Amino acid sequence: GRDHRKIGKQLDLYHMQEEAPGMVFWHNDGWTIFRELEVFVRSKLKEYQYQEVKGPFMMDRVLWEKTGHWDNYKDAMFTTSSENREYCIKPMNCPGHVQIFNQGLKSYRDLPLRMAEFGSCHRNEPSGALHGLMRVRGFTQDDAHIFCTEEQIRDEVNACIRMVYDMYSTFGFEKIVVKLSTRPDKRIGSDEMWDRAEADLAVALEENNIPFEYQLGEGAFYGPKIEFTLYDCLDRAWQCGTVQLDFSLPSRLSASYVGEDNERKVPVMIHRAILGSMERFIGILTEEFAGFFPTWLAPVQVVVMNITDSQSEYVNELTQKLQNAGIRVKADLRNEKIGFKIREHTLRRVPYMLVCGDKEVEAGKVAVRTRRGKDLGSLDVNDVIEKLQQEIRSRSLQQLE
Amino acid sequence: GRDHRKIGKQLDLYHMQEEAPGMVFWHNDGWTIFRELEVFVRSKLKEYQYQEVKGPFMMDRVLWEKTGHWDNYKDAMFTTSSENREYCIKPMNCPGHVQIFNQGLKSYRDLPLRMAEFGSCHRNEPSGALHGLMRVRGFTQDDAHIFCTEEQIRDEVNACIRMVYDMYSTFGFEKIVVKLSTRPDKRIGSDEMWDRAEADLAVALEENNIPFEYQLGEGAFYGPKIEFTLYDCLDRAWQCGTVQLDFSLPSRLSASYVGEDNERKVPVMIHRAILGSMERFIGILTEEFAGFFPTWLAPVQVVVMNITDSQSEYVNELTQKLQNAGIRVKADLRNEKIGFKIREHTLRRVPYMLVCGDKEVEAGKVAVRTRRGKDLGSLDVNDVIEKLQQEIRSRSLQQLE
Numbered sequence: 146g147r148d149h150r151k152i153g154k155q156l157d158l159y160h161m162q163e164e165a166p167g168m169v170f171w172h173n174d175g176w177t178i179f180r181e182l183e184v185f186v187r188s189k190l191k192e193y194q195y196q197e198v199k200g201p202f203m204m205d206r207v208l209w210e211k212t213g214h215w216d217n218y219k220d221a222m223f224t225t226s227s228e229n230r231e232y233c234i235k236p237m238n239c240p241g242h243v244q245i246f247n248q249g250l251k252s253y254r255d256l257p258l259r260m261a262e263f264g265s266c267h268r269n270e271p272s273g274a275l276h277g278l279m280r281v282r283g284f285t286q287d288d289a290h291i292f293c294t295e296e297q298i299r300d301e302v303n304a305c306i307r308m309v310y311d312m313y314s315t316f317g318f319e320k321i322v323v324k325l326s327t328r329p330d331k332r333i334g335s336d337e338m339w340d341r342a343e344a345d346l347a348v349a350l351e352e353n354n355i356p357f358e359y360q361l362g363e364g365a366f367y368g369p370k371i372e373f374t375l376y377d378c379l380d381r382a383w384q385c386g387t388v389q390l391d392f393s394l395p396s397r398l399s400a401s402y403v404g405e406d407n408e409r410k411v412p413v414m415i416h417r418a419i420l421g422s423m424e425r426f427i428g429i430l431t432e433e434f435a436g437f438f439p440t441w442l443a444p445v446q447v448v449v450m451n452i453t454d455s456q457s458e459y460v461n462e463l464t465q466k467l468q469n470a471g472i473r474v475k476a477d478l479r480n481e482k483i484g485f486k487i488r489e490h491t492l493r494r495v496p497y498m499l500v501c502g503d504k505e506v507e508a509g510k511v512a513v514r515t516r517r518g519k520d521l522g523s524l525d526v527n528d529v530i531e532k533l534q535q536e537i538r539s540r541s542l543q544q545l546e
Numbered sequence: 547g548r549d550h551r552k553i554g555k556q557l558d559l560y561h562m563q564e565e566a567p568g569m570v571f572w573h574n575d576g577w578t579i580f581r582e583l584e585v586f587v588r589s590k591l592k593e594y595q596y597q598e599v600k601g602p603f604m605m606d607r608v609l610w611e612k613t614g615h616w617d618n619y620k621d622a623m624f625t626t627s628s629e630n631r632e633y634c635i636k637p638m639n640c641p642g643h644v645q646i647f648n649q650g651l652k653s654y655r656d657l658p659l660r661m662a663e664f665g666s667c668h669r670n671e672p673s674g675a676l677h678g679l680m681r682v683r684g685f686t687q688d689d690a691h692i693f694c695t696e697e698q699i700r701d702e703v704n705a706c707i708r709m710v711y712d713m714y715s716t717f718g719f720e721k722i723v724v725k726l727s728t729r730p731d732k733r734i735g736s737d738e739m740w741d742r743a744e745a746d747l748a749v750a751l752e753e754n755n756i757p758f759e760y761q762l763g764e765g766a767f768y769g770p771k772i773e774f775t776l777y778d779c780l781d782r783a784w785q786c787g788t789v790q791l792d793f794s795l796p797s798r799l800s801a802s803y804v805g806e807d808n809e810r811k812v813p814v815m816i817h818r819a820i821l822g823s824m825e826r827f828i829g830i831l832t833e834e835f836a837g838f839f840p841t842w843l844a845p846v847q848v849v850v851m852n853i854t855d856s857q858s859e860y861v862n863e864l865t866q867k868l869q870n871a872g873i874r875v876k877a878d879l880r881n882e883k884i885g886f887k888i889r890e891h892t893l894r895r896v897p898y899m900l901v902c903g904d905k906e907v908e909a910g911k912v913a914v915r916t917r918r919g920k921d922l923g924s925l926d927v928n929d930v931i932e933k934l935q936q937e938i939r940s941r942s943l944q945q946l947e
């Protein structure tokens with residue numbers, strides 16, 4: 146009952162085809178989940194004071210060659226040509242963000258500059274390694290890059306760490322393992338630069354009261370990182386989050402700002418993603434909930450249904466009210482037994498089934514059944530609407546009484 | 547002047563650069579506009595009963611050969627390869643939508659099925675023909691495909707036409723010219739199918755009293771199209787909308803549903819895009835308004851400012867209250883003359899400037915000035931918040947009077 150590929154078919158969320166290896170066809174209901182996840186991340190972007198931008202899908206290979214990634218990663222990049230020029234389909238958003246940073250003179254007053262994007266990335270991953278939503282060729286990162294001074298690093302990493310635990314707690318993930326990857330054998334910068342950079346990550350973690358462990362020698366050539374691994378309800382580990390310091394890319398791409406002493410300074414860059422791949426995170430969630438998505442995420446939140454034809458216009462009014470309240474609602478007005486309707490929508494993991502018999506219509510009430518088979522009895526319509534709105538707005542993991 | 551390139555730079559909306567010809571980098575404020583336009587389109591998708599999906603970025607050339615796309619467009623497609631297979635970066639969303647349609651058995655009871663996407667598309671346009679946001683290589687099409695029966699064509703084409711005029715009138719575009727583009731020299735489908743399709747589109751225009759001219763030979767290879775051209779305040783013509791009737795691609799991609807009888811039948815497909823390209827439409831709006839976007843589209847909707855440090859706390863509170871009412875708002879507490887502050891936000895095209903002096907703090911009021919220079923008086927805070935909320939939620943073209 147926790148295979149995201151079977152559940153994804155059963156709930157009509159997505160499909161894959163050999164015509165587009167590792168690129169997801171999002172169906173209506175799956176795209177609803179994705180969009181709702183995007184809304185959630187955007188709420189955190191506002192709360193943590195990020196800009197949100199959007200970069201193009203391709204950029205001249207010439208620019209990618211300047212980044213220092215081209216040699217290590219050419220074989221995993223899609224390329225395409227036009228008019229004697231070769232373009233890379235972007236595998237990451239960082240160089241694009243630096244291009245945005247480079248427009249307009251920046252000063253120290255603009256820092257820290259926090260730049261997020263739901264970045265549509267492609268990697269030419271071997272087809273034999275592809276698997277459902279979790280190993281794909283086309284993915285979307287909840288990405289951001291922070292441009293800051295050396296003095297601002299700790300405070301910026303501190304905020305990233307808070308954002309990580311904040312976001313994972315929303316989905317019920319409270320068991321998190323954290324690993325700090327230290328200086329590799331081949332690296333840029335001085336040993337003193339590495340001492341200070343590793344300490345900044347370590348102290349920011351201490352300032353959040355987070356125990357962690359080292360992954361010795363596993364840092365990037367361009368700086369140390371923290372990785373965050375969450376545990377699902379089956380105690381399976383999923384590495385999702387990354388906070389990566391980068392002392393190389395800004396210099397490579399001629400990024401600079403006017404310092405307070407009026408000299409040209411090169412900013413430090415922090416790369417961070419919390420969920421990682423949105424597609425992969427939806428896979429993880431599907432398995433974690435076994436398809437019983439929390440109401441805020443559920444493609445269809447409520448189905449309103451009549452026992453007989455006599456309650457059809459009451460169901461229509463109630464459905465319009467729920468629609469006006471911002472709820473994802475459908476009316477099931479089929480000439481079918483109420484038990485048939487409940488079973489179908491239970492199998493589809495609809496959080497709430499609002500049942501209207503003659504007694505409900507006559508009292509201006511509605512009978513509420515949950516997808517877990519709980520009869521909550523019959524309740525005043527406006528009180529039920531208010532409770533559903535609260536469960537949705539608060540992104541609650543739990544259903545009503 | 548109302549050059550979208552200049553306004554785009556001045557208001558920090560977007561940029562373009564030679565490393566990515568005809569591809570847009572949206573900066574924070576431009577991306578806010580884009581996303582509000584998406585919110586608007588999604589409101590119409592809901593109103594007109596469309597699903598929303600997302601297709602893959604690329605698909606195997608083999609599939610594009612089956613549609614007729616390879617024969618009809620290879621020199622304008624970007625291609626890439628992996629593991630000895632060639633992929634086309636999608637120039638259109640229709641084949642992907644049919645792939646989604648083909649998952650799971652469809653019956654007549656599922657039709658009309660209206661499937662929309664903000665489709666990321668790419669066309670390898672000659673670089674010399676590119677200009678601004680109006681002719682680009684990478685774009686986002688407000689696309690949809692309607693799968694319906696032959697009997698449903700008249701109602702579904704009518705609804706598309708209604709949707710076009712509805713959406714254009716939101717932006718104040720009332721001068722619309724219409725052409726019916728008929729069978730091109732290179733095409734698919736029989737002359738009897740083209741007779742039927744062309745006649746269906748002609749009747750729809752006649753029934754709506756839409757005058758039109760035939761545009762001979764300019765149909766799509768798969769079917770005829772109604773083309774909608776809007777006129778801006780300079781009386782320039784911009785072709786934006788298209789409604790196309792297709793009796794050929796569904797058969798080529800093995801689309802079918804079980805009819806009201808029990809026989810296997812091929813659905814009709816209607817293609818339509820209204821804004822055309824999100825990027826181009828933003829370009830057109832930018833010029834139409836000269837950067838004075840209606841409040842609902844404006845990157846920053848309200849700026850709240852003090853006279854002295856005396857009113858700082860009141861201003862921060864009012865700002866929080868506008869933020870709670872859903873308004874894009876910032877506070878300006880700087881130690882600058884009120885005329886300097888007001889000018890700055892007028893230059894940035896902020897719709898409303900809210901000013902708090904001692905008399906305003908005392909009375910629970912706020913002084914409101916519009917970016918055109920009208921002083922609306924000191925007014926009760928909650929009456930202003932309510933009036934702004936209505937202006938925004940109703941997507942009004944005019945500010946308060």
Ligand SMILES: C[C@@H](O)[C@H](N)C(=O)OC/C=C/Cn1cnc2cc(Br)c(Cl)cc2c1=O
Pocket residue numbers: 214218221222236237238239268269288289290387389416417418
């Ligand atoms: C958080 C982001 O802002 C950051 N840029 C990132 O992707 O970090 C997560 C992992 C990075 C490691 N990685 C993994 N796979 C790759 C595949 C390709 Br192709 C290229 Cl060019 C680079 C890489 C690459 O750095």
Ligand SMILES: [Zn+2]
Pocket residue numbers: 237238239290416417
């Ligand atoms: Zn990055």
Ligand SMILES: [Zn+2]
Pocket residue numbers: 638639640691817818
């Ligand atoms: Zn189409």
